[PDB]
Design a protein around this ligand. Structure first.
Ligand SMILES: Nc1ncnc2c1ncn2[C@@H]1O[C@@H]2COP(=O)(O)O[C@H]3[C@@H](O)[C@H](n4cnc5c(N)ncnc54)O[C@@H]3COP(=O)(O)O[C@H]2[C@H]1O
Ligand SMILES: Nc1ncnc2c1ncn2[C@@H]1O[C@@H]2COP(=O)(O)O[C@H]3[C@@H](O)[C@H](n4cnc5c(N)ncnc54)O[C@@H]3COP(=O)(O)O[C@H]2[C@H]1O
Lengths: 141, 134
């Protein structure tokens, strides 16, 4: 796109598509979430319900907060607690047709923002890296 | 502009850190409590040695058969930390920092003696860029 087109673009045109987004389910236990986070290398990822609607975010710090005990790391709790119980639910959301400037503003305070369609089906994530890389092209030239 | 990294960086005394020689359990506890996912590793001279974060800590104890939580207090941060990292000077132009945060959530600011001065974060870049577009 040319610079006089970037502001008119949509969030969906620059998001990471959902089939490339690591995620877990609300009903998974924290051991499964910790394995997915660690193996994919990400510090926080979306949490979906079985019908593919976003309900929250789960991250390593949330999980460790649940198992750092008084005397020891209580790793047995990883199999006893579900993602639902500790996930972050107050998160912003974008629509695939949202103007990209709405996404630009939301990533000031958020490393990524989840994107859904009009029926709340999860569609992908809008990340700071993609924003920064594209603004890279247009401030320069 | 003529704006510099030093005018927009998070100053060092506001930055969470650990020290070389600290073990991974301490570092993971600090990350968990502060809520940050990666922070600088300093020495007692306040020099920057690398970055430590939750992902690299978890990968260091992610075994074939089990998560080896008991190893966390047996491994020092310097055995796991990332050292091949970009660096900024306080007088660098803000656009040089902008380039460096494309691939990095933050970039450390330091002087020629490797003394740690602050971090240049994506958030401060994005706030200023939003001002410019808007
Ligand atoms: N495999 C990899 N290859 C190259 N660089 C990597 C990388 N993993 C992480 N990074 C770098 O680290 C930044 C912070 O990652 P973090 O996992 O904390 O934070 C990530 C993570 O929470 C989430 N995320 C990104 N891509 C994801 C994906 N495909 N699936 C799930 N979550 C993802 O969005 C946040 C912001 O991502 P963003 O790309 O802006 O920023 C990333 C990227 O610049
Ligand atoms: N206490 C808090 N208050 C408000 N918002 C908060 C927050 N903790 C995290 N966030 C938000 O989450 C983003 C990603 O944080 P993360 O810890 O993964 O990644 C952070 C962390 O690795 C590091 N960082 C930022 N501030 C730090 C500090 N004071 N001390 C140590 N490390 C810091 O720089 C990365 C990028 O930070 P940035 O501010 O651009 O982006 C932050 C910010 O938008």
């Amino acid at each position: 796109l040319q610079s006089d087109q970037l502001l008119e673009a949509t969030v969906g045109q620059f998001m990471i598509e959902a089939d490339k987004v690591a995620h877990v389910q609300v009903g998974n236990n924290l051991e499964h979430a910790l394995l997915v986070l660690t193996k994919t290398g990400y510090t926080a990822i979306p949490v979906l319900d079985p019908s593919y609607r976003l309900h929250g975010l789960i991250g390593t710090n949330m999980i460790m907060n649940s198992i750092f005990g008084l005397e020891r790391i209580e790793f047995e709790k990883l199999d006893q607690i579900t993602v639902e119980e500790v996930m972050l639910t107050d998160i912003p959301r974008l629509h695939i047709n949202d103007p990209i400037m709405k996404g630009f503003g939301m990533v000031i305070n958020n490393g990524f923002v989840c994107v859904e369609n009009d029926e709340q089906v999860f569609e992908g994530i809008f990340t700071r890296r993609v924003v920064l890389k594209e603004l890279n092209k247009h401030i320069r030239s």
